[PDB]
RNA sequence: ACGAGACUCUGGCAUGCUAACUAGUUACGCGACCCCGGUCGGCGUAACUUCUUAGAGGGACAAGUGGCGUU
């Protein structure tokens, strides 16, 4: 299974909160902007991050959430 | 006032077409490069089945390469990638003259100067790089540049007022000259985000696109804003054509093309082929070059094809 | 005048065999002897698949000279195999227009992928308490 | 002169830290330098049971030790190494000069 | 030049598989035609992914059992070799269509599965998948080819050929249509 | 030199006169608060750092004792004569090291005390020089024939993965009483600092932080102006 | 807050980057044999990292599409 544990959700929902404007639907794009508004030790975190951004960009674009 | 009519696809690349770009020199040329590590060469062959045909493809890069232009002689060219690097391509063999270093991010665009012997790179480094044909810097700003990645650079096209122009992500779009390069104007007032600038052929007047879709447009002899029109979607590529007055926009999945002489759209060249409605995302175009002779327009998508349109009337 | 050449590897476990595409007439020869006399011969069909595959008239411009080190036996031939193929596609793919390199590429994937893909399956380290990577010992009650 | 000078160390950032000096004052100096030759790293395996005694499950450890080494020739005298060698050197990195 | 594979010397067209349940788990015909029985593999990966494989390559997969022989692959294929050489010199007809009518012959189409506790002994009668069909079919074969050749001056490449034959013809002097009629037997015995 | 070793065994006895070493000063030093040594070879040169709590102890009465220790190093290890020289020096954050609280409380129940009161107070006096958290763990015959253990945890206490490598420190001491042996296990975990003197660089993989963007402003005309 | 996860080592790839006479490749010359070319882990020196070695980086995240699910 791939479910994301709670830092990275709660990272990610910090970085849409905070950063909005500067992000987008392309994960190559706000992974770049993930990388460089915010200290990630490892990589493959980044990557989760990084997705879950892309996802609730995705989520963002249809309507409101309630976090 | 016309109408733009499609006449082909270009199938062959695996993915979202980043640059493409044509030279008047081989008019039966088309040299784009992809978010895949190649870059292809098309061959034209004008056929009911194909437009066009891949003739050579150019490796050697090892991320997405997202710029490329070709110089004036017709036989060199330069491409910026994400690795870092920049190659000085030839395109009879295939091969690499020399490699440009010294980038430590990930690079945006290049550009070859009008007397083809300057380069101009920017990429999401702070820092804008003046490199000679032969690989090395001359000058490179890095202190008083743009404050965050630096999206787009480009040339005059005339060397009466040698100017480049210098848009990137931190809503300040900026003039350097190229004597002394430093700062001569910089511009304000535009929200979100830049994408593009694009420089008229006569080196007089400058068209800006960013995320808000807003074409705002400047001039390059004076530091005096012209008017500002709504593009509607996201701004990603600017073009001007060289015989007509006009100025074409990839705003989204959708391309406009307007008049500068009225201001007034001409066409709205939008996904004609209709079929993704089974709960789908329309694909986006993210390049886009105008021919020579301002005939025939390519436009890249993130469909892996690259679309052909010609003028009907 | 110039002189066209390229070098492709090809791998399955542990076995390196590397080709060697340059002009001539068609002759193909791995460690210095052809691909006739190479053991075991039940496996010429595997050997000889591409060039059958592909006909003689693609590989009468050039000639391939492979050197393979390492490995077992069916696993030179697997190297072989894919490293003239990979040479072959990457010869055509430089100098030739790539066309031909497309409908080469199309029919060596539809008719079997280790052909270019090589096979990313390594042997798993032994663990303590077994005879081998997932076998245990036999359990004794009472 | 042909000059060799071996550095063999336990840590492999501290030893790419003082290769990176030694290659950047070699490059300062302005003479003709060797690159960094990358010899293959040697693993000293202990494996061992865990209990002092016969009791428990057959349980076993696994001790590594990596070890590094570089390599890199110069063309100059003696004086010149030696007085390139003595500067900012490392701990745990061990250097090691002979002439052929 | 490749117009047809030739398995070795045979054919691979114009082979006919009647039974219309084993039309995609028999992959013989302008596909999955190899000059050769050995593959690379990755077929038991996936969950479906081993009816894609040849039915020779298969067969030769399940030859090689019984501890001694186990990895000897290259053994398996040229006595398979052998036995289709000798099923062509005897009977006079292709080995694949032989051998593809063994298979539909030799596989049982309804089997009955022990229920109840642990230690007693009740059956019902159930229908099995197309795959068991084909796996029980070669599993059959096999083991029947093996057992005869065991203790026996006949060699198994011949002992092999002459399981095919009698399989496909249904004629019971083999030990996989015995063992196929003994579980519809047993099935139809308490439906 | 004709016999040169090779360079596995270089290694090995490198470890092994370390580990020797580091045994003999921590079975002398057990008063002066001991902490490790430090073994930094020079050309023709061999000096060895201490760092312990009392510096004015370890000298004794105008160097006598770091003579002693230097003599019998030499004498010991096979060394030329003159070739050592041993330094002692004083290290900061003494409740940040796990060695020196465990000599402490070791020293704290060989003269008589509550071993609760004393865990309490180097406990109190180690979250008092600023750490993240630490455990205490004192097991043996206490107060009865049946031993027992008490395990006082509060703070932050990490476990598992490679960050306990390098973010805790572990110390291990007995105490030899009159009626048996009492054990000591002390755990402090360090924090995190960009310094690099108080604890370690990297910080914790599962911590991420973000920086504050600026006051950006939104013009609402297009305005454009010159400079320089 | 701990455990899990996160973390560390290894495997799987990059014809791109950094360098290899204690690792090689390709050209050239000499030498041996056969019938004009082939073989040589025989000898030696003009480039290079395709093999090997090992450092920094890259790459995979359920990212894209179609169904099920409070969507």
Same mark, same amino acid.
């Given at each position: 299974?791939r479910?994301?544990?709670?830092?990275?959700?709660?990272?990610?929902?910090?970085i849409?909160?905070?950063?909005?404007?500067?992000?987008?639907?392309?994960?190559?794009?706000?992974k770049?902007?993930?990388?460089?508004?915010?200290?990630?030790?490892?990589k493959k975190?980044?990557?989760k991050?990084?997705?879950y951004?892309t996802h609730?960009?995705?989520?963002?674009?249809?309507?409101?959430?309630?976090? | 006032?016309?109408?733009?009519?499609?006449r082909?696809?270009?199938?062959?690349?695996?993915?979202?077409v980043?640059q493409?770009?044509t030279?008047?020199?081989?008019?039966?040329?088309?040299?784009?490069?992809?978010?895949?590590?190649?870059?292809?060469?098309?061959?034209?062959?004008?056929d009911?089945?194909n437009?066009?045909?891949?003739?050579?493809?150019?490796?050697?890069?090892?991320?997405?390469?997202?710029d490329?232009?070709?110089?004036?002689?017709?036989?060199?060219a330069?491409?910026?990638?994400?690795?870092?690097?920049?190659?000085?391509?030839?395109?009879?063999?295939?091969?690499?003259?020399?490699?440009?270093?010294?980038?430590?991010?990930?690079?945006?665009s290049?550009a070859?100067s009008?007397?083809?012997?300057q380069?101009?790179?920017?990429?999401?480094?702070?820092?804008?790089?003046?490199?000679?044909?032969?690989?090395?810097?001359?000058?490179?700003?890095?202190?008083?540049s743009?404050?965050?990645?630096?999206?787009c650079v480009?040339?005059?096209?005339?060397? %009466?007022?040698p100017?480049?122009?210098?848009?990137?992500?931190?809503?300040?779009?900026?003039?350097?000259?190229?004597?002394?390069?430093?700062?001569?104007?910089?511009?304000?007032?535009?929200?979100?985000?830049?994408?593009?600038?694009?420089?008229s052929?006569?080196?007089?007047?400058?068209?800006?696109?960013?995320k808000?879709?807003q074409?705002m447009?400047?001039?390059?002899?004076?530091?005096?804003?012209?008017?500002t029109?709504?593009?509607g979607?996201?701004i990603?590529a600017?073009?001007?054509?060289?015989?007509?007055?006009?100025?074409?926009?990839?705003?989204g999945?959708?391309?406009?093309?307007?008049?500068?002489?009225?201001?007034?759209?001409?066409?709205?060249?939008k996904?004609?082929?209709? %079929?993704?409605?089974?709960?789908?995302?329309?694909?986006?175009?993210?390049?886009?070059?105008? %021919?020579?002779?301002?005939?025939?327009?390519?436009?890249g998508?993130?469909d892996?094809?690259?679309?052909?349109?010609?003028?009907?009337? | 005048?110039?002189?066209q050449?390229?070098?492709?590897?090809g791998?399955?476990?542990?076995?390196?065999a590397?080709?060697? +595409?340059?002009?001539?007439?068609?002759?193909?020869?791995?460690?210095?002897?052809?691909?006739?006399?190479?053991e075991?011969?039940?496996?010429?069909?595997?050997?000889?698949?591409?060039?059958?595959?592909?006909g003689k008239?693609?590989?009468?411009?050039?000639?391939?000279?492979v050197?393979?080190?390492?490995?077992?036996?069916?696993?030179?031939?697997?190297?072989?195999?894919?490293?003239?193929?990979?040479?072959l596609?990457?010869?055509?793919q430089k100098?030739?227009?790539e066309?031909?390199?497309?409908?080469?590429?199309?029919?060596?994937?539809?008719?079997?992928?280790?052909?270019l893909?090589?096979?990313?399956?390594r +042997?798993?380290?032994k663990?303590?308490?077994?005879?081998?990577?997932?076998?245990?010992?036999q359990?004794?009650?009472? | 002169?042909?000059?060799?000078?071996?550095?063999?160390?336990?840590?492999?950032?501290?030893?790419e830290?003082?290769?990176?000096?030694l290659?950047?004052?070699? !490059?300062? !100096?302005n003479?003709?330098?060797?690159?960094?030759?990358?010899?293959?790293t040697?693993?000293?395996?202990?494996?061992?049971?865990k209990?002092?005694?016969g009791?428990?499950? !057959?349980?076993?450890?696994?001790?590594?030790?990596?070890?590094? !080494?570089?390599?890199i020739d110069?063309h100059?005298?003696?004086?010149?190494?030696?007085?390139?060698?003595?500067?900012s050197?490392?701990?745990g990195?061990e250097v090691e000069?002979?002439?052929? | 030049? $490749?117009?047809?594979?030739?398995?070795?010397?045979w054919?691979?067209?114009?082979v006919?598989?009647?039974d219309?349940?084993?039309?995609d788990?028999?992959?013989?015909?302008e596909?999955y035609?190899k000059?050769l029985?050995?593959s690379?593999?990755?077929?038991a990966?996936?969950?479906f992914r081993?009816?894609?494989? $040849?039915?020779?390559?298969?067969?030769?997969?399940?030859m090689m059992?019984?501890?001694?022989?186990?990895?000897?692959?290259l053994?398996?294929?040229?006595?398979?070799?052998?036995?289709?050489?000798?099923?062509?010199?005897?009977?006079?007809?292709? $080995?694949?269509?032989?051998?593809?009518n063994?298979?539909?012959?030799?596989?049982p189409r309804?089997d009955?599965?022990?229920?109840?506790?642990?230690?007693?002994?009740?059956?019902?009668?159930?229908?099995?998948? $197309?795959?068991?069909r084909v796996?029980?079919?070669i599993?059959?074969?096999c083991? @029947?080819?093996?057992e005869?050749?065991?203790?026996?001056?006949?060699?198994?490449?011949?002992?092999?050929?002459?399981?095919?034959?009698?399989?496909?013809? @249904?004629?019971?002097?083999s030990?996989?249509?015995?063992?196929?009629?003994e579980?519809?037997?047993?099935?139809?015995?308490?439906? | 030199?004709?016999?040169?070793?090779?360079?596995?065994?270089?290694?090995?006895?490198?470890?092994?006169?370390?580990?020797?070493?580091?045994?003999?000063?921590?079975?002398?030093?057990? *008063?002066?608060?001991?902490s490790?040594?430090?073994?930094?070879?020079?050309?023709?040169?061999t *000096?060895?750092?201490?760092l312990?709590?009392?510096?004015?102890?370890?000298?004794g009465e105008?160097?006598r004792?770091?003579?002693?220790?230097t003599?019998?190093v030499?004498k010991?290890?096979?060394?030329?004569?003159?070739?050592?020289?041993?330094y002692?020096?004083?290290?900061?954050?003494?409740?940040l090291?796990?060695?020196?609280?465990?000599?402490?409380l070791?020293?704290?129940?060989?003269g008589?005390?509550?071993v609760?009161?004393?865990?309490?107070?180097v406990?109190?006096?180690?979250?008092?020089?600023?750490?993240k958290?630490?455990?205490?763990?004192?097991?043996?015959?206490?107060?009865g024939?049946?031993?027992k253990?008490?395990?006082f945890?509060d703070?932050?206490?990490?476990?598992?993965?490679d960050?306990?490598?390098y973010?805790?420190?572990?110390?291990?001491?007995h105490?030899?009483?009159?009626?048996?042996?009492?054990?000591?296990?002390?755990?402090?975990?360090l924090p995190?600092?960009?310094?690099?003197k108080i604890?370690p660089?990297?910080?914790?993989?599962?911590?991420?932080?973000?920086?504050?963007?600026?006051?950006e402003?939104?013009?609402?005309?297009?305005?454009? *102006?010159?400079?320089?």
């Open positions: 299974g479910v994301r544990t709670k830092t990275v959700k709660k990272a990610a929902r910090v849409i909160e905070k950063y909005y404007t500067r992000l987008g639907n392309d994960f190559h794009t706000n770049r902007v993930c990388e460089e508004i915010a200290i990630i030790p490892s975190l980044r990557n991050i990084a997705g951004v609730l960009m995705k989520r963002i674009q249809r309507g409101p959430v309630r976090g | 006032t016309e109408q733009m009519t499609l082909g696809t270009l199938k062959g690349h695996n993915g979202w980043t493409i770009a030279t008047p020199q081989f008019p039966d040329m088309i040299l784009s490069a992809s978010r895949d590590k190649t870059i292809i060469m098309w061959k034209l062959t004008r009911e089945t437009y066009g045909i891949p003739q050579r493809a150019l490796r050697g890069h090892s991320h997405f390469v997202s490329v232009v070709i110089s004036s002689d017709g036989q060199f330069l491409s910026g990638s994400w690795d870092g690097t920049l190659r000085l391509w030839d395109l009879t063999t295939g091969t690499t003259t020399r490699r440009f270093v010294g980038h430590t991010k990930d690079v945006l290049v070859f009008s007397d083809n012997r380069i101009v790179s920017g990429s999401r480094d702070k820092t804008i790089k003046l490199w000679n044909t032969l690989g090395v810097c001359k000058y490179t700003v890095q202190d008083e743009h404050s965050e990645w630096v999206s480009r040339f005059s096209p005339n060397s %009466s007022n100017i480049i122009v210098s848009c990137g992500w931190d809503k300040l779009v900026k003039v350097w000259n190229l004597a002394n390069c430093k700062l001569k104007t910089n511009h304000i007032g535009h929200t979100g985000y830049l994408n593009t600038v694009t420089v052929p006569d080196g007089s007047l400058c068209a800006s696109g960013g808000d879709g074409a447009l400047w001039d390059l002899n004076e530091g005096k804003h012209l008017y029109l709504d593009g979607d996201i990603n600017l073009c001007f054509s060289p015989n007509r007055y006009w100025l074409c926009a990839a705003t999945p959708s391309i406009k093309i307007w008049d500068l002489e009225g201001k007034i759209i001409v066409d709205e060249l996904q004609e082929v209709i %079929s993704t409605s089974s709960k789908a995302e329309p694909p986006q175009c993210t390049s886009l070059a105008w %021919s020579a002779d301002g005939q025939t327009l390519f436009a998508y993130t892996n094809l690259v679309r052909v349109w010609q003028v009907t009337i | 005048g110039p002189l050449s390229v070098q492709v590897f791998r399955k476990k542990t076995a390196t590397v080709a060697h +595409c340059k002009r001539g007439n068609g002759l193909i020869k791995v460690n210095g002897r052809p691909l006739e006399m190479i075991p011969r039940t496996l010429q069909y595997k050997l000889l698949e591409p060039v059958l595959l592909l008239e693609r590989f009468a411009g050039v000639d391939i000279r050197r393979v080190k390492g490995g077992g036996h069916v696993a030179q031939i697997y190297a072989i195999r894919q490293s003239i193929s990979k040479a596609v990457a010869y055509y100098y030739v227009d066309a031909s390199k497309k409908e080469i590429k199309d029919i060596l994937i539809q008719y079997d992928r280790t052909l893909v090589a096979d990313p399956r +042997c798993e380290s663990k303590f308490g077994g005879p081998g990577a997932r076998a245990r010992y359990k004794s009650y009472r | 002169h042909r000059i060799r000078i071996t550095l063999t160390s336990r840590n492999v950032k501290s030893l830290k003082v290769c990176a000096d290659i950047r004052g070699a !490059k300062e !100096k003479l003709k330098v060797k690159g960094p030759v990358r010899m293959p040697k693993t000293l395996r202990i494996t061992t049971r209990t002092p005694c009791e428990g499950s !057959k349980t076993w450890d696994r001790f590594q030790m990596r070890i590094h !080494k570089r390599l110069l100059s005298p003696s004086e010149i190494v030696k007085q390139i060698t003595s500067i050197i490392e701990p990195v000069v002979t002439i052929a | 030049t $490749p117009d047809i594979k030739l398995f070795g010397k054919s691979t067209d114009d006919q598989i009647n219309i349940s084993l039309q788990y028999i992959a013989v015909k596909k035609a000059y029985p050995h690379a593999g990755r077929y990966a996936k969950r081993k009816a894609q494989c $040849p039915i020779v390559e298969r067969l030769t997969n399940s059992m019984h501890g001694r022989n186990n990895g000897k692959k053994m398996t294929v040229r006595i398979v070799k052998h036995a289709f050489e000798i099923i062509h010199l005897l009977t006079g007809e292709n $080995p694949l269509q032989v051998l593809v063994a298979i539909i012959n030799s596989g309804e009955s599965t022990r229920i109840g506790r642990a230690g007693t002994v009740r059956r019902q009668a159930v229908d099995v998948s $197309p795959l068991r796996n029980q079919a599993w059959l074969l083991t @029947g080819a093996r005869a050749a065991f203790r026996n001056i006949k060699t198994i490449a011949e002992c092999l050929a002459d399981e095919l034959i009698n399989a496909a013809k @249904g004629s019971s002097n030990y996989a249509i015995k063992k196929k009629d579980l519809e037997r047993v099935a139809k015995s308490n439906r | 030199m004709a016999v040169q070793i090779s360079k596995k065994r270089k290694f090995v006895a490198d470890g092994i006169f370390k580990a020797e070493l580091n045994e003999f000063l921590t079975r002398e030093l057990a *008063e002066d608060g001991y490790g040594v430090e073994v930094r070879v020079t050309p023709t040169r *000096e060895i750092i201490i312990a709590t009392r510096t004015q102890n370890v000298l105008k160097g004792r770091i003579r002693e220790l003599a019998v030499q010991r290890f096979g060394f030329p004569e003159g070739s050592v020289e041993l002692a020096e004083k290290v900061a954050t003494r409740g090291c796990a060695i020196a609280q465990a000599e402490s070791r020293y704290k129940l060989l008589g005390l509550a609760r009161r004393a865990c309490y107070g406990l109190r006096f180690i979250m008092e020089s600023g750490a958290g630490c455990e205490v763990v004192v097991s043996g015959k206490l107060r024939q049946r031993a253990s008490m395990k945890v703070g932050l206490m990490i476990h598992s993965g960050p306990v490598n973010y805790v420190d572990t110390a291990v001491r105490v030899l009483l009159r009626q048996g042996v009492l054990g000591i296990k002390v755990k402090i975990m995190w600092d960009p310094s690099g604890g660089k990297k910080p914790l993989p599962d911590h991420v932080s973000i920086v504050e963007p600026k006051d402003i939104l013009p609402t005309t297009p305005i454009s *102006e010159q400079k320089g």
